[PDB]
Point group: C2
Chain length 171, copies 2
């Protein structure tokens, strides 16, 4: 099938995700990666983070009326990546101009007066490289924050700083 691979991603069903209704595809290979924070509660164990992913999706689908959680990927302080829309489905995280050219990843928590643990940061970087190896991301993809993209206070000041120091980062 999808033999347990690429990016140690927690599958949708494992975090009890509502089935998606999104159909819009993304054109492979994606050039951009936009990083953001949820401004929601944070979590530091697989159990609590799977519940947090369900909580974020519930808000997006039930209250905002979206086809699925808006991010392509969610990152938890448990150091695991959670499958959102994924690699081949357009997301709702960075406006009408980006959503079609990127993969959107978000850290579950508020990184205003906080910084995600090293394990969360490693998960993020594990995920992307996996994207390249699949052909979903261009080998020389560029990483942007949610400030460089849209009028926002996310991915959080302390997190924006770290992302800036990244090899594939583009001002």
């Amino acid at each position: 099938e999808d033999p347990p691979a690429c990016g140690s991603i927690v599958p949708r069903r494992e975090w009890r995700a509502l089935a998606s209704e999104c159909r819009e595809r993304l054109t492979r290979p994606v050039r951009y990666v936009v990083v953001s924070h949820t401004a929601g509660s944070h979590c530091d164990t697989p159990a609590s983070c799977a519940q947090q992913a369900q909580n974020v999706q519930s808000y997006h689908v039930r209250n905002l009326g979206w086809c699925d959680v808006g991010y392509n990927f969610l990152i938890g302080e448990d150091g695991l990546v959670y499958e959102g829309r994924g690699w081949n489905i357009k997301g709702a995280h960075a406006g009408p101009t980006w959503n079609p050219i990127s993969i959107g990843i978000s850290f579950m928590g508020n990184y205003m007066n906080r910084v995600p643990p090293p394990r969360a940061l490693r998960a993020a970087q594990n995920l992307l490289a996996c994207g390249v190896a699949l052909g979903a991301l261009r080998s020389n993809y560029e990483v942007k924050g949610h400030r460089d993209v849209q009028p926002t206070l996310s991915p959080g000041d302390r997190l924006y700083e770290i992302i800036q120091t990244w090899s594939h980062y583009r001002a």
Copy 2:
């Protein structure tokens, strides 16, 4: 000479490992991977799994007199991989005819009547894919259960069947 896209690994100093006294190196690329289980306590959070790794190393170093934790890598039920002796150092997990030609990875727990969670299995599998990309493991590496190379219950009855289904498995 190939550094790419490969993985999240909780480094030694993050799980507060005693320094290693090991010096004997492995011959790249390694052909075999022996999967075992510690037959000790399991953990399902980063906090408790870092502690458990420290505990297994404690046992190996302090009680058995080895130069470091015997396994090259350890897998926690929190879904994270913990750096042991790593890809370049000979381990102590499968006896003298196998220790010098294999990478030993151990799941923290006892799997005679329990299976590791999907996230643990994914971490392990993605770790191996990483070994290959790194040139640390042969592209045609073979996975063996501890019991295939040594008289023991390890890696546990329930975990042994799962791995019997892995793509690179060879009894």
